[PDB]
Amino acid sequence: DIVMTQTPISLPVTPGEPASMSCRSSQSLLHSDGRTYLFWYLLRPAQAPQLLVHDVSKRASGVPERFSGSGSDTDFTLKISRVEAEDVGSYYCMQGTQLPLTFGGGTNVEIK
Amino acid sequence: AVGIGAVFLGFLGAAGSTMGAASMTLTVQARNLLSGTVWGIKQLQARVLAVERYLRDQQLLGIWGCSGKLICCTNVPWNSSWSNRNLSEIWDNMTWLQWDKEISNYTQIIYGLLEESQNQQEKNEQDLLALD
Amino acid sequence: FLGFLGAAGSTMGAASMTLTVQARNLLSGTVWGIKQLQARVLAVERYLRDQQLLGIWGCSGKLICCTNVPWNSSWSNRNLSEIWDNMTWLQWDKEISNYTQIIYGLLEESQNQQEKNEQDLLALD
Amino acid sequence: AVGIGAVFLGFLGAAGSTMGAASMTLTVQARNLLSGTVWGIKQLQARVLAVERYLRDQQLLGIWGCSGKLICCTNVPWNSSWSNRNLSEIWDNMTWLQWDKEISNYTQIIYGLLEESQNQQEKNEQDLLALD
Amino acid sequence: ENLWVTVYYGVPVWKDAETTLFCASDAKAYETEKHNVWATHACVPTDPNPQEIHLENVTEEFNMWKNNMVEQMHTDIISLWDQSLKPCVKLTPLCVTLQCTNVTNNITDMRGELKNCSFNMTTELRDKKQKVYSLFYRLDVVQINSNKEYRLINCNTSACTQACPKVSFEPIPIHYCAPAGFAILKCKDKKFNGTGPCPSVSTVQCTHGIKPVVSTQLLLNGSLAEEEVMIRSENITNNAKNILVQFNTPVQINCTRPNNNTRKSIRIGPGQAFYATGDIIGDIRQAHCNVSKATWNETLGKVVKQLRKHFGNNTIIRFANSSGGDLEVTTHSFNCGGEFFYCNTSGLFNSTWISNNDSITLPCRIKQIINMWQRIGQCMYAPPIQGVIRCVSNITGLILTRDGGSTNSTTETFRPGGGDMRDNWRSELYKYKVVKIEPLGVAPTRCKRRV
Amino acid sequence: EYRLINCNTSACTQACPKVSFEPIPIHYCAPAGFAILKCKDKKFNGTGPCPSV
Ligand SMILES: *[C@@H]1O[C@H](CO)[C@@H](O)[C@H](O)[C@H]1NC(C)=O
Ligand SMILES: *[C@@H]1O[C@H](CO)[C@@H](O)[C@H](O)[C@H]1NC(C)=O
Ligand SMILES: *[C@@H]1O[C@H](CO)[C@@H](O)[C@H](O)[C@H]1NC(C)=O
Ligand SMILES: *[C@@H]1O[C@H](CO)[C@@H](O)[C@H](O)[C@H]1NC(C)=O
Ligand SMILES: *[C@@H]1O[C@H](CO)[C@@H](O)[C@H](O)[C@H]1NC(C)=O
Ligand SMILES: *[C@@H]1O[C@H](CO)[C@@H](O)[C@H](O)[C@H]1NC(C)=O
Ligand SMILES: *[C@@H]1O[C@H](CO)[C@@H](O)[C@H](O)[C@H]1NC(C)=O
Ligand SMILES: *[C@@H]1O[C@H](CO)[C@@H](O)[C@H](O)[C@H]1NC(C)=O
Ligand SMILES: *[C@@H]1O[C@H](CO)[C@@H](O)[C@H](O)[C@H]1NC(C)=O
Ligand SMILES: *[C@@H]1O[C@H](CO)[C@@H](O)[C@H](O)[C@H]1NC(C)=O
Ligand SMILES: *[C@@H]1O[C@H](CO)[C@@H](O)[C@H](O)[C@H]1NC(C)=O
Ligand SMILES: *[C@@H]1O[C@H](CO)[C@@H](O)[C@H](O)[C@H]1NC(C)=O
Ligand SMILES: *[C@@H]1O[C@H](CO)[C@@H](O)[C@H](O)[C@H]1NC(C)=O
Ligand SMILES: *[C@@H]1O[C@H](CO)[C@@H](O)[C@H](O)[C@H]1NC(C)=O
Numbered sequence A: 001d002i003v004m005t006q007t008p009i010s011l012p013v014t015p016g017e018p019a020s021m022s023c024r025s026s027q028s029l030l031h032s033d034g035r036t037y038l039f040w041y042l043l044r045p046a047q048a049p050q051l052l053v054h055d056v057s058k059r060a061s062g063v064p065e066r067f068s069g070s071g072s073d074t075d076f077t078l079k080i081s082r083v084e085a086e087d088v089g090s091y092y093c094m095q096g097t098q099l100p101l102t103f104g105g106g107t108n109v110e111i112k
Numbered sequence B, D: 001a002v003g004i005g006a007v008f009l010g011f012l013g014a015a016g017s018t019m020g021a022a023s024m025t026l027t028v029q030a031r032n033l034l035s036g037t038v039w040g041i042k043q044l045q046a047r048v049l050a051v052e053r054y055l056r057d058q059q060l061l062g063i064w065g066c067s068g069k070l071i072c073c074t075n076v077p078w079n080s081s082w083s084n085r086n087l088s089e090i091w092d093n094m095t096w097l098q099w100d101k102e103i104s105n106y107t108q109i110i111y112g113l114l115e116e117s118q119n120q121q122e123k124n125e126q127d128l129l130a131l132d
Numbered sequence C: 001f002l003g004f005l006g007a008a009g010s011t012m013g014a015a016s017m018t019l020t021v022q023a024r025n026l027l028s029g030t031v032w033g034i035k036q037l038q039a040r041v042l043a044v045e046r047y048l049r050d051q052q053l054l055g056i057w058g059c060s061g062k063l064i065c066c067t068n069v070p071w072n073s074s075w076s077n078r079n080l081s082e083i084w085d086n087m088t089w090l091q092w093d094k095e096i097s098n099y100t101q102i103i104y105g106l107l108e109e110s111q112n113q114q115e116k117n118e119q120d121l122l123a124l125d
Numbered sequence E: 001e002n003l004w005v006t007v008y009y010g011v012p013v014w015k016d017a018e019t020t021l022f023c024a025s026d027a028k029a030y031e032t033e034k035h036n037v038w039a040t041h042a043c044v045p046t047d048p049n050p051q052e053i054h055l056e057n058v059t060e061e062f063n064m065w066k067n068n069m070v071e072q073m074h075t076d077i078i079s080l081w082d083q084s085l086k087p088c089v090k091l092t093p094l095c096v097t098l099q100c101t102n103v104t105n106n107i108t109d110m111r112g113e114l115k116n117c118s119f120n121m122t123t124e125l126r127d128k129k130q131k132v133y134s135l136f137y138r139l140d141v142v143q144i145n146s147n148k149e150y151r152l153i154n155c156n157t158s159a160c161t162q163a164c165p166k167v168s169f170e171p172i173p174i175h176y177c178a179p180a181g182f183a184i185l186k187c188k189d190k191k192f193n194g195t196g197p198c199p200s201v202s203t204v205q206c207t208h209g210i211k212p213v214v215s216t217q218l219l220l221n222g223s224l225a226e227e228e229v230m231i232r233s234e235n236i237t238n239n240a241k242n243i244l245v246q247f248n249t250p251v252q253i254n255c256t257r258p259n260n261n262t263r264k265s266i267r268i269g270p271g272q273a274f275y276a277t278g279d280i281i282g283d284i285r286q287a288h289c290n291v292s293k294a295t296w297n298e299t300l301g302k303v304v305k306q307l308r309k310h311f312g313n314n315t316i317i318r319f320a321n322s323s324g325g326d327l328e329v330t331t332h333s334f335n336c337g338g339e340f341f342y343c344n345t346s347g348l349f350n351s352t353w354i355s356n357n358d359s360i361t362l363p364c365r366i367k368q369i370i371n372m373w374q375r376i377g378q379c380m381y382a383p384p385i386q387g388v389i390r391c392v393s394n395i396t397g398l399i400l401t402r403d404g405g406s407t408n409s410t411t412e413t414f415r416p417g418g419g420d421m422r423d424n425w426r427s428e429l430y431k432y433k434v435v436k437i438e439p440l441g442v443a444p445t446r447c448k449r450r451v
Numbered sequence F: 001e002y003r004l005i006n007c008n009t010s011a012c013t014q015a016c017p018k019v020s021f022e023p024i025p026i027h028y029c030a031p032a033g034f035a036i037l038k039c040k041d042k043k044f045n046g047t048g049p050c051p052s053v
């Protein structure tokens, strides 16, 4: 299997400052059909999960012009520009290029 | 709804499945037939031989009524003297490898005049168009 | 069985029934090390160009294909009666050979190019 | 009447014109994809590569439902590349060279919804419809 | 009257074109472990049975004098000959002075034909030399100014290669086949002069077995006629065009070399050897060829009878020998088992014809340093062959020529010619033609496409 | 007086003084239209059926 490492674990973010996280993989995520499968999931407390960024650097449904991601291979980052109060929860990175589907560690974001 | 690449049976990945399940994965084996001094001619010869061999199957599909199609059905009858079997024991209890060794010495009759009945469908169609 | 080019002296009515025989014989499979390697590539390229030309018209995978272009440019000056029963395919090419470049362009502009456009604008609704 | 020949645009002539104009000259650029020991092997290899590229393109155009058509419009909704430009400012105010720069990396997820949900689902239902 | 364009694909239409043909070789002798100068490992096996298709109502036009198959065959034969002499010994250190003397011993009277020469030759070790002797023909040594000083005839033009001793010069049949999209037309008219419309046109898959036999002034082991003796020329009025004759029945010729040779091997370097004639045991006699007198006279009479038609009706036909030139064009040069002969054909073309168990012995000469294909700068040094050689062949043709006539009639003299190898294969590739199939055509029917 | 052992068979080339004889791994791949089958059995002995392909 392929393991995922998320750095950092707890990221205190001021309400209105830029923030950035990271996720890394032990193997290349490139697939035979020329795609890289990375999913960024927002896990708000007591609410349904949300897909923020799919396919490394492509915006999914919703995501009101705030979240964006970038990365080439085995090193990916997520960027938030104007952090609001609703962006509190856990963030996970999941692969899809090889079974089993392995999630990430986690990154708790709280208002400081 | 965006796509995960882990749900993908690869090349020849349905070679042990039944005939009714391996028939939905034809594109994977269809796309691999056309991929990419001394010791510089043998590779070129192999590539040229691979190009002219794929064309001989597309020309054979040019006749009959199956052009640009992977699953195509015709109107050629099947007699019980070829494989006296039901539809619940061919498509659900048999592999494509096991079927190509049972119907193996009866294929030249099928591939020939029995299925080249399009000659009776191209002269039966231009006559209809020449009547208004 | 007539074989390859069997109906060469036969009339047009008897030579149009054996198109399959000559259709399959157009694609078959250092001295004598580069002769074949250059002959087979040319044999493939000559077939591919003809199959692309027959198909940029409306005739993709049919051996006999009849269209809707009027008989104006190609001046045969002869009626169907004494063409399909009193002439062979070799004599036909001697008569219509000058008009085989202004009839290959009326099949690409007046047909299957215009024709493909009202179909694109009729499945719109 | 007409007796001039300078109005012919030629190969790649309509490369700066809009979409509505460049779509009527597809046949001109469709022709030039198939034209016709050291040095001998170099030229021979180039001919083989050109043929392989054309064959791969014609196989892709035909794994979908578009076998032998130059303008072929399908049954997939437009959400794959969320370009908010509407129909009026694309086909009259833009060229193909700018469209190719616009949808440049949203092009592998369109090629996967044309061979899975467009033709593969359609020919399975058509086969099942005649089966009844 | 409601007539529209209809496209047909696969129509039987052909046009003249030029392409490149390939091999087809019989598998009977294909698997043997004998190397030939004409390669077989690069030629595909032939079909088990030919496919002959007869064409009715087809009348094609042939031309034997403007065929590209002859040029392609010439190029392939020259390329094969050039390629067959590469991997083995080159005789560069043989350009030394010689001390040659007359052989004498048994001379039937071959007085000065053979010479006993001695020279200094290098050995395997670089700093040592050896003294050896060898026998050379008079046609290979040239005097440079009793033991006189001589030298090889090629030591001022080019250092050449020794003939590979593992290969053979025996001709084998070769079939030429057209590629896909090309067909070969065969004229089956028995009385065909090679130029003009042919009534019996027949689609043939490939060609038959054509043996690449190299000879001058005569045709050996060719294809016989079917009805009568055929005379073919490009322009019978012009006197600068060779005349090809095809025999109805073949005459027999026997050739032999009475001398019993002995080949010795001399090492001139590391892994390189030179083959020389040490001694001749027995008696020394001239090489000769014989032709039956009566059969040759009947064949010449038939040739005269069929030649009378083109020229006149009361003119006399005279045969004379060659005029002059090099040794290869004034003598019947051929190969018998690996030894090259140059026979004197002067007793054959010696007659005068009026409208109103003897044998003919032809003296021959043998040469070891040859230069063929009319090229300059390359040899083929044939090594000596042990024993006595014999050959039985067929004479199935002639290559005659005409002189500048005087008084416009009353005499016509014909003498043998040759020199060009394309005339040898023009006599066999005369009924074949290559065409290119065009399968696309348009014809008017009354279809209107559904809209 | 001595001599080299090859002087009656051939005169052969010296080894290039810059190349090395150290082996390096080489992988073999299959062309288009073909495939390579690998037997994953642990007690395989060459000839015989392989149930893990
Ligand atoms: C092998 O056979 C079993 C039968 O129980 C089936 O469940 C399985 O899917 C088959 N393997 C594949 C790869 O289809
Ligand atoms: C059905 O077709 C096959 C074709 O090979 C033939 O062998 C068999 O006899 C046929 N049965 C009939 C016509 O009853
Ligand atoms: C096919 O199934 C029917 C019943 O569904 C049965 O009667 C028949 O024997 C079967 N055919 C064979 C060849 O077993
Ligand atoms: C089909 O016929 C061939 C004839 O050579 C035979 O060898 C083969 O065993 C036959 N197939 C079966 C399944 O019996
Ligand atoms: C060939 O010509 C003859 C003479 O006119 C004719 O009778 C015959 O029918 C022709 N052959 C064919 C196959 O039409
Ligand atoms: C139709 O025939 C007329 C008669 O000369 C000719 O001038 C005209 O060019 C033809 N039309 C086309 C499209 O060639
Ligand atoms: C039709 O062609 C025939 C020749 O067979 C000719 O006699 C006749 O006049 C033509 N008819 C017309 C209307 O041109
Ligand atoms: C077509 O053009 C060629 C070349 O100018 C000419 O020889 C021929 O006669 C023309 N065709 C006709 C029917 O006049
Ligand atoms: C080039 O651009 C000008 C101005 O934008 C426009 O008028 C013209 O039509 C364009 N050229 C073509 C061939 O469309
Ligand atoms: C459908 O459109 C949405 C909106 O942009 C997009 O997020 C989604 O990826 C599209 N579906 C596919 C299969 O690409
Ligand atoms: C396209 O239609 C009008 C004309 O430009 C425009 O106002 C509208 O916003 C466009 N449609 C969409 C969905 O953006
Ligand atoms: C190209 O891919 C990169 C990610 O590698 C992405 O950021 C960019 O938006 C893509 N470009 C287009 C035009 O889609
Ligand atoms: C040639 O001369 C040598 C002496 O140099 C002699 O031994 C040999 O017998 C001679 N050969 C003949 C054929 O006379
Ligand atoms: C060979 O060389 C020696 C000197 O080493 C000389 O005496 C002899 O005459 C030479 N033999 C010839 C030239 O035939």
Ligand SMILES: *[C@@H]1O[C@H](CO)[C@@H](O)[C@H](O)[C@H]1NC(C)=O
Pocket: E193, E195, E196, E197, E233, E234, E235, E236
């Ligand atoms: C060959 O025969 C034809 C008759 O078909 C004749 O026209 C031609 O002149 C002959 N050739 C020679 C060189 O006489």
Ligand SMILES: *[C@@H]1O[C@H](CO)[C@@H](O)[C@H](O)[C@H]1NC(C)=O
Pocket: E235, E237, E238, E239
């Ligand atoms: C044949 O020879 C005659 C006489 O020399 C000459 O006038 C003529 O041009 C030549 N060529 C022919 C008839 O094609």
Ligand SMILES: *[C@@H]1O[C@H](CO)[C@@H](O)[C@H](O)[C@H]1NC(C)=O
Pocket: E260, E262, E281, E387, E388
């Ligand atoms: C020629 O000489 C060899 C010995 O070298 C001998 O075996 C053979 O019989 C001789 N030939 C004749 C015809 O005397």
Ligand SMILES: *[C@@H]1O[C@H](CO)[C@@H](O)[C@H](O)[C@H]1NC(C)=O
Pocket: E252, E253, E254, E290, E291, E292, E359, E392
């Ligand atoms: C050639 O030799 C054969 C015997 O092999 C003989 O029958 C024939 O008569 C000879 N030919 C001549 C011209 O002597």
Ligand SMILES: *[C@@H]1O[C@H](CO)[C@@H](O)[C@H](O)[C@H]1NC(C)=O
Pocket: E309, E312, E313
């Ligand atoms: C020559 O004369 C004879 C009669 O003596 C005659 O049969 C023959 O046809 C003539 N040949 C010609 C005129 O070419």
Ligand SMILES: *[C@@H]1O[C@H](CO)[C@@H](O)[C@H](O)[C@H]1NC(C)=O
Pocket: E321, E322, E323, E324, E330, E346
């Ligand atoms: C031809 O014969 C004459 C005798 O009339 C003779 O002088 C001449 O040398 C001979 N030429 C050849 C090449 O044999």
Ligand SMILES: *[C@@H]1O[C@H](CO)[C@@H](O)[C@H](O)[C@H]1NC(C)=O
Pocket: E327, E330, E331, E344, E346
């Ligand atoms: C051939 O024989 C003739 C006389 O029979 C003679 O003059 C000539 O020198 C001989 N040799 C050649 C090469 O002609």
Ligand SMILES: *[C@@H]1O[C@H](CO)[C@@H](O)[C@H](O)[C@H]1NC(C)=O
Pocket: E321, E346, E347, E350
């Ligand atoms: C031709 O034969 C005669 C009679 O035998 C003879 O006198 C004459 O010398 C021969 N011609 C030649 C060139 O030898």
Ligand SMILES: *[C@@H]1O[C@H](CO)[C@@H](O)[C@H](O)[C@H]1NC(C)=O
Pocket: E297, E298, E301, E350, E351, E352
């Ligand atoms: C035999 O040849 C001579 C030439 O020396 C000739 O005069 C004679 O007529 C010939 N015999 C026959 C029967 O033709």
Ligand SMILES: *[C@@H]1O[C@H](CO)[C@@H](O)[C@H](O)[C@H]1NC(C)=O
Pocket: E221, E250, E392, E393, E394
């Ligand atoms: C010579 O011709 C005869 C027929 O007269 C034939 O039997 C024999 O095989 C031929 N010899 C060859 C081709 O070597």
